[PDB]
Design a protein around this ligand. Structure first.
Ligand SMILES: O=S([O-])[O-]
Ligand SMILES: O=S([O-])[O-]
Ligand SMILES: O=S([O-])[O-]
Ligand SMILES: O=S([O-])[O-]
Lengths: 222, 220, 219, 220
């Protein structure tokens, strides 16, 4: 409908501030990605509150659905929200009562996406896998995208693999809102995700993160 | 070892109660277990016409009908000849809650399904009692082990009139009849279910499902 | 008028938890206006039960609640014709139960047709391992939703080792007769107790006390 | 001698963000810890007029203000002079979700409250963004120990215009600052909370709460 100004190779700048279980932190991010291939990588550095007393994994989905491969037949709300950009709000509900909220305001200047991220988490039990740092990774997921109360909404059944091979369940709901008027809303669709910490130092003060995401219509034609 | 044929017949009897309304539904169909495809003709034998949306029942009418790749353990085909059973909760966003069970056995080239379905707390003016549902959207079941039992969780959504959606969370626990059947690792199962045809009051329904198991990105 | 100060209670429950079928008969007595009732239960089929008896006990009638004059008593007003209820029980470890009761009256006896189904209880959870001790006293929040009287409760089972096991209850209550006036928002305090039982819980004596009120500061 | 005096003052500063809207609210109040009664005058310092229902904030503006009987351990009065902190989640039935924190300290006759409040996913057409709330109904908080921490769960409801209700589930975790403060057994805390008065835009609000601990039936 208009030129997004999104290049096949983009830079990513990010600042997160937040508080989990009373512990304040600031984390900076610098990365690169390929929006049309749905792939991105980022180097993160804890600037305040290091070392973190909680599992770094709970934060990683808060570190942009622009980085998702959208096929021609599915409306791409995220790429169409640029150059102006968009924002999202998210709740994360963990099976043991831990609850997080998160926000990201996403803008673009030239070849770089800028991200102002906030993350707040409460009610994580002392001996749960989050405060005990017993998480290994997020398992691959599928986000369900649909218009709810006039707003594009993504719901996800997520699972963290734990040490000892158990899983730890988290339900995610994200609301996505374009900054500019006139962005077409998509029909129901699915977005496959996989996210991975490629490397980190001992205290997770420095972390290299990667995501791959692909939009599709599900069976039978996916 | 499983004795599962490339073409199988399916016999089904469901009895249940939703909102205090009792019903009995018989099913006769055929499927291709290794293609993850199946079809069934359903007939309401008691309780017709149903005062609620037929769609709430349809996932209760067998993960044997899922295409499993070699690298993922197929718990369901490995549960035969002896068979398996499942229990399910369906939690809808307006407080409607269903439970369902199915005991699955096999005799020759026919699967037998003893199905029970109970639903409570559906609001009088919600999309279920008002029959405003159109279809289940395609879904992806998350398969994992919890307390020694294979468990599938799904973020499901019913398409409604006007292209609204009505959310339902599914949890299924699957248990082989035979002791010591090997549990699979974490995996995904893509699903799509469709009422191909029905009469006006949904006393007669033709149902279809396609399901494929996979490892998610980046492999799938 | 229809309901007497001393009433008798007849009950038949049929159900299935974890794939295990059972039938339980009940005979008891209660004082509706005092909100008190007692019942002797007997497992007729499926004994000994392989799960915690405690999960069943709220399924074994809000007629047995003391309602003050300033709150509409939907339940006593539903007789002689009677009423029905549907319930979901959502336990914190994924166990989910649904239950129904059709309540009728003839003479001085209430009759209860009860159904109870439970799924997805973990093998090593407190229910399948029978590690529950009692329900803690609760308060049911009563309100109207989509024309129907609804009760929500944050409940808790005390377990061996003194931990608690959380359950959320939603009940929908429906009078048989049309035109029964719905109450305003109110609270109902409950306490439920197994007074006695044999080793396998094939025979159980159950007791409940319930009192309706307006909450602080008027309670 | 006692850290808790019959008549105490309350100073409070809340900062927060609901649906992207930043705000700062100051409070000055007085209360009677032993009678479980308190009142506070609140003033929106930044972000007025608030675009959301003020009612969602009100339980975030101290369980020291609760009448505890002799037979129930009073964790909150035992937490002073050093103080305590709480974290809370508020889960509304339409997907709006809030988290809040309060760090409570004491100097002389005054409690000091550092409060943070964050809310997301409230729909534009819902009662919160539409400002259609009237009051919280009277509630009963269920207090119990989980993983060594005092925890309170509440089935809450806002009364709406037209006399419908809007449900919210609250979980609070309470933690004394000092080591070795004895945890109480299971108990109930009754609450009622009321906006006594406000100006048109809720830039100025006078708030009141009454709370009483008890053991439930038959004890109460
Ligand atoms: O991002 S994927 O490689 O987990
Ligand atoms: O079974 S699918 O085509 O909905
Ligand atoms: O019924 S009360 O005594 O638990
Ligand atoms: O404190 S009460 O009056 O809502």
């Amino acid at each position: 409908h208009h030129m997004s100004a999104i290049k096949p190779d983009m830079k990513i700048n990010l600042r997160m501030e937040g508080n989990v279980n009373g512990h304040h932190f600031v984390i900076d991010g610098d990365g690169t990605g390929k929006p049309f291939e749905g792939k991105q990588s980022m180097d993160l550095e804890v600037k305040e509150g290091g070392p973190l007393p909680f599992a770094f994994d709970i934060l990683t989905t808060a570190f942009n659905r622009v980085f998702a491969e959208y096929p021609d037949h599915i409306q791409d709300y995220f790429k169409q929200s640029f150059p102006k950009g968009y924002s999202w709000e998210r709740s994360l509900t963990f099976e043991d009562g831990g609850i997080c909220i998160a926000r990201n305001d996403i803008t673009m200047e030239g070849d770089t996406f800028y991200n102002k991220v906030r993350f707040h988490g409460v009610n994580f039990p002392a001996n749960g896998p989050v405060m005990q740092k017993k998480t290994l990774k997020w398992e691959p997921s599928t986000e369900k995208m649909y218009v709810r109360d006039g707003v594009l909404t993504g719901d996800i059944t997520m699972a963290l693999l734990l040490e000892g091979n158990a899983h730890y369940r988290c339900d995610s709901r994200t609301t996505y809102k374009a900054k500019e008027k006139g962005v077409k809303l998509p029909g129901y669709h699915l977005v496959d995700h996989c996210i991975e910490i490629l490397s980190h130092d001992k205290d997770y003060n420095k972390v290299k993160l990667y995501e791959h995401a692909v939009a599709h219509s599900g069976l039978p034609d996916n």
